[PDB]
Design a protein around this ligand. Structure first.
Ligand SMILES: *[C@@H]1O[C@H](CO)[C@@H](O)[C@H](O)[C@H]1NC(C)=O
Lengths: 504, 108, 49
């Protein structure tokens, strides 16, 4: 709500139609001829694709015969636009990268863009339903900028991607909306033990050319960190020119002078303009190499700076390949705390869902009364509201598991819960410490029917953006005069929830 | 290439003009990967020493293969066997975006 | 002589070699007569051979 002067994403008519060919038409020449020429004028529509449209035709009159024509050229474009560049054969359930190039052919006017990668439940992105992913950027006239976007194809087939870019103090917006093919792997055979109870209850009546070790480390003395790469080739003789595509964690830029220091470096070269590009939106870097070795580790490292402060940061990406071959490439993503730089998602036998939205419903608001408390408990969404005790804890890299001890079923929902039962609630590793959670403590909790992990009775629980959790002390831990106000609203919440039940 | 063929005594070696342009009608700013080779009927032989990494300037470019470099490669230095052999050129250009990539070729 | 012993061997992989042989032997023939000892006489005779 900072600035009021942009076109709402909700009103950004994207580019939609991108046929690789069309107008298979067949039209007849009824016009009264002049000069021995009937003339036809077919008013048509211009597809949402920016290219010169070549037009090829053939006149089949039975009297004179066939006749090819001089192809016709209709030159289509806008001053400022996008084109989106994707792969084709992507694999479901594997984090990938895309690049979006906005071109600006305005001769003298720079531009500031707020562009959103648009949310899609078929993809694990950074864009939740409610938490937008808007990046703000600036463009030199008669220049274009490369924007990376790393995602997870959660589903198969024809998936469309959309990105809507809107501008400030000016006119146009645009949007790309482009499909491609997603497909499955099928292995699910990673270091399985002989009987791991993977099976359900109710059924039944890759870098082959390249070594690539990338690690982003921190700096000694806004914030600057180290990027480290460590590369090799696997073959009999050393290999030809290899290329690196490197992209910046949201709002990052390298150290301009260390960049310069490295380019004079042996066996290396980065042209001047991608090397004296401006600090304003210097975001994607391409470094070409003379050759790469098959014999040992030749690493590199350099600095990165934080241009804009946002709490959450897209992983950086690094894609390396031989000059001749793109398709046998190797791609790594980095993030300092995320190992191998991969987004948090949640995975079972072949399904995954994106676990990257806010840890729990936002706390610390001025309003903590029964009035709002009940309102978020009287909503229909609330399937379950429990009060348990933090009994056990499995901590791990992926997620951190809190074993909860349900003694009472306050409001079961679509759940069949017995009394004195032990059930598994999850919280992502990015959230763990923000929760300030300790075992042996009681907790009164609630969520939705949609927020249940698994199927019965081998199920689990997930704390999401709208899950509400709060610790419950003992009787000997609420007698303090300071702790009155909490334990007051706890007693009155309970009883009026209990006696009245839900209203409906 | 300047002339459709390769002149055996052309001291210049070979000067090549790279034209790279967007489909919509605008010129491209970038950098190029140029590799050549020889084809003998169905038999093609790649020419590894000639690859040049070269910039692309406002939708225009020049590259030059000096005769000195050219002749160092050759296997059998000068013979009649060489005639009947044609040349093919593979071009890989990357935008300043680092994103889009095009494979191009002049053969024959 | 070490180079020319394995001639017709490194002709495919390295087409630089014949130059080093020729100009080294040229340096010999123009400046072979003006030696004193027989050792140098003998070896450089053979390489021109
Ligand atoms: C294989 O196991 C590693 C951990 O050992 C994990 O990172 C990776 O996701 C697994 N791959 C598949 C396809 O399950």
């Amino acid at each position: 709500n900072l600035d009021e002067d942009i076109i709402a994403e909700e009103n950004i008519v994207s580019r939609s139609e991108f046929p690789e060919s069309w107008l298979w038409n067949v039209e007849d020449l009824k016009e009264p001829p002049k000069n021995g020429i009937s003339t036809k004028l077919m008013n048509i529509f211009l597809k949402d694709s920016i290219t010169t449209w070549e037009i090829l035709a053939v006149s089949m009159s039975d009297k004179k015969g066939i006749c090819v024509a001089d192809p016709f050229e209709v030159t289509v474009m806008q001053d400022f636009f996008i084109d989106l560049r994707l792969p084709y054969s992507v694999v479901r359930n594997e984090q990938v990268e895309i690049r979006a190039v906005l071109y600006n052919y305005r001769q003298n006017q720079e531009l500031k863009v707020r562009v959103e990668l648009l949310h899609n439940p078929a993809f694990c992105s950074l864009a939740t339903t409610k938490r937008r992913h808007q990046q703000t950027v600036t463009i030199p006239p008669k220049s274009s900028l490369s924007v990376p976007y790393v995602i997870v194809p959660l589903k198969t087939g024809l998936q469309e991607v959309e990105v809507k870019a809107a501008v400030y103090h000016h006119f146009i917006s645009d949007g790309v909306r482009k499909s491609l093919k997603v497909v499955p792997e099928g292995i699910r055979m990673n270091k399985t033990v002989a009987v791991r109870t993977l099976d359900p209850e109710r059924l039944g009546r890759t870098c082959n050319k390249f070594d690539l070790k990338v690690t982003i480390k921190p700096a000694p003395e806004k914030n600057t960190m180290i990027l480290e790469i460590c590369t090799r080739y696997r073959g009999d003789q050393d290999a030809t020119m290899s290329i690196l595509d490197i992209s910046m964690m949201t709002g990052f830029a390298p150290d301009t002078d260390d960049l310069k220091q490295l380019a004079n470096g042996v066996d290396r070269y980065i042209s001047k303009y991608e090397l004296d590009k401006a600090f304003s939106d210097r975001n994607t870097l391409i470094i070409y190499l003379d050759k790469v070795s098959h014999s040992e580790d030749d690493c590199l490292a350099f600095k990165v700076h934080q241009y804009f402060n946002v709490e959450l940061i897209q992983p950086g990406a690094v894609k390396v390949y031989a000059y001749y071959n793109l398709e046998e490439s190797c791609t790594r993503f980095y993030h300092p705390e995320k190992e191998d730089g991969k987004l948090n998602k949640l995975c079972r036998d072949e399904l995954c869902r994106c676990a990257e939205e806010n840890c729990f419903i936002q706390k610390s608001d001025d309003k903590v009364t029964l009035e709002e408390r009940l309102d978020k408990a009287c909503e229909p969404g609330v399937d379950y509201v429990y009060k348990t005790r933090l009994v056990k804890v499995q901590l791990s890299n992926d997620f951190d598991e809190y074993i909860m001890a349900i003694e009472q079923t306050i409001k079961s929902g679509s759940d069949e819960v017995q009394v004195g039962q032990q059930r598994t609630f999850i919280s992502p590793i990015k959230c763990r410490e923000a929760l300030k959670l300790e075992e042996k403590k009681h907790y009164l909790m609630w969520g939705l029917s949609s927020d249940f992990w698994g199927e019965k009775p081998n199920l689990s629980y997930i704390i999401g953006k709208d899950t509400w959790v709060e610790h419950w002390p003992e009787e000997d831990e609420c007698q303090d005069e300071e702790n009155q106000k909490q334990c007051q609203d706890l007693g009155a919440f309970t009883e009026s929830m209990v006696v009245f039940g839900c209203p409906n | 290439p300047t002339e459709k063929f390769y002149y055996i005594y052309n001291e210049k070696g070979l000067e090549v003009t790279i034209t790279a342009r967007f489909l919509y009608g605008k010129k491209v700013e970038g950098t190029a990967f140029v590799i050549f080779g020889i084809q003998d009927g169905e038999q093609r032989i790649s020419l590894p020493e000639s690859l040049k990494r070269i910039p692309i300037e406002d939708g225009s470019g020049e590259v030059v293969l000096s005769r000195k470099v050219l002749l160092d490669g050759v296997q059998n230095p000068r013979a009649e066997d060489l005639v009947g052999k044609s040349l093919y050129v593979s071009a890989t250009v990357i935008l300043h975006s680092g994103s889009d990539m095009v494979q191009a070729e002049r053969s024959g | 002589i070490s180079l020319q012993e394995a001639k017709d061997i490194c002709e495919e992989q390295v087409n630089s070699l014949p130059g080093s042989i020729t100009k080294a032997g040229d340096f010999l023939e123009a400046n072979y007569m003006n030696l004193q000892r027989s050792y140098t006489v003998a070896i450089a005779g053979y390489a021109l051979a």
